[PDB]
């Protein structure tokens, strides 16, 4: 019995699950700012669900057998290629930027699904609302075409409008030189090619667009790297927040039902990420589209539907 009208009619309400700590928390910050530690201890000690940041193969992880698929069939973009040749002619910069935004949309849907179905809160590392920081940073460095930020705005406007913002927006504040030294510390050669202008643009987008605009619909919690290691203090300030801003207080079971209906339907979540706006960086030609779709269909367990794939160990096809 998937959550539907018949389930909600009888006895399925979400307010009876919602609690004081039934909040969605997004941790944020520049690259190598250490969001991982803050988010993971926040989840572990506040008793929430952690979601590691949405990568290229997040979708591959939430479907099938949970293992990453070939970049050709999923993603069709690289982060090392972006760090090596960010201004390449492939359009790989915005192809990657759109793919990981779609992955973030999927993850936000998945996290709201868990919250609205179990009542447990979640913590995320970045989200749809802080994905634009990288898009603007790439634009200032002259990577994306101006056409390719209008399309991003279109997709974000028509998709992110449907969902509730985080309760708490925790931000870790690290200066550009320290981030640079951490990148030079971990030794990733592709990360080693990140210019200070890119990181500065990211920090500027954070400080001047992201953090102020969360401040009117969520409670924003800023810590620099010194106060971000004390997760006890961070969660103490999390527990002291009133959370009387934004649309979350004025939510009843009628709206939570519609949100659960949208959020459980993954094809409706991703509907507008494939609007017919033909940009060279993301448009796929018909021959390549058909070929790659056939190679995807050839994957084990991917042809018919879950439970109907005998080639992967599925029984009773003729009685299903």
């Amino acid at each position: 019995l998937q959550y539907g009208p018949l389930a909600f009619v009888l006895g399925e309400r979400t307010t009876r699950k919602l609690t004081e700590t039934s909040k969605v928390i997004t941790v944020d910050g520049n690259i190598c700012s250490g969001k991982g530690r803050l988010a993971r201890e926040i989840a572990e000690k506040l008793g929430l669900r952690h979601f590691p940041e949405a990568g290229i193969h997040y979708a591959d992880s939430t479907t099938g057998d949970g293992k990453p698929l070939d970049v050709q069939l999923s993603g069709n973009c690289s982060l090392e290629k972006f760090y090596d040749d960010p201004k390449s002619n492939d359009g790989n910069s915005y192809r990657l930027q759109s793919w990981l935004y779609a992955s973030r949309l999927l993850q936000y849907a998945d996290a709201l699904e868990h919250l609205l179905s179990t009542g447990q809160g979640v913590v995320l590392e970045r989200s749809i609302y802080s994905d634009f920081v990288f898009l603007e940073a790439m634009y200032r460095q002259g990577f994306i075409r101006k056409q390719c930020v209008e399309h991003y705005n279109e997709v974000k406007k028509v998709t992110a409008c449907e969902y509730l913002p985080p309760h708490v927006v925790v931000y870790v504040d690290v200066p550009v030189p320290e981030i640079q030294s951490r990148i030079q510390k971990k030794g990733n050669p592709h990360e080693m090619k990140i210019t200070a202008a890119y990181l500065q643009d990211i920090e500027n987008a954070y400080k001047k667009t992201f953090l102020p605009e969360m401040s009117e619909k969520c409670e924003v919690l800023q810590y620099s790297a010194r106060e971000a290691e004390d997760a006890e203090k961070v969660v103490e300030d999390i527990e002291y927040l009133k959370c009387d801003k934004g649309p979350w207080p004025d939510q009843d079971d009628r709206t939570f039902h519609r949100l659960r209906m949208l959020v459980q339907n993954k094809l409706e979540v991703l509907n507008y990420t494939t609007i017919p706006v033909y940009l060279p960086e993301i448009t796929i030609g018909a021959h390549q589209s058909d070929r790659v779709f056939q190679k995807f269909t050839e994957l084990p367990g991917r042809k018919y539907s879950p439970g109907y794939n005998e080639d992967v160990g599925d029984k009773w096809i003729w009685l299903k």
């Binding site: 057998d65 367990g301 160990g313 599925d314 299903k320």
Partner: protein
């Protein structure tokens, strides 16, 4: 198994399978009996037998 999430159609719905088979057998039996009595009713109305 193979899938991470449990597929909704991973095992047969035994109640639905039994209902489908039973309702089909009843439909066939009812149709056959109706045709038999209908031929009988036609034959006796028309005086054929």
């Amino acid at each position: 198994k193979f899938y991470i999430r449990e597929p909704p159609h991973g095992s047969p719905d035994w109640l639905k399978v039994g209902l489908t088979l039973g309702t089909s057998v009843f439909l066939w039996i009812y149709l056959i009996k109706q045709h038999k009595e209908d031929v009988l009713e036609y034959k006796r109305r028309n005086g054929l037998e």
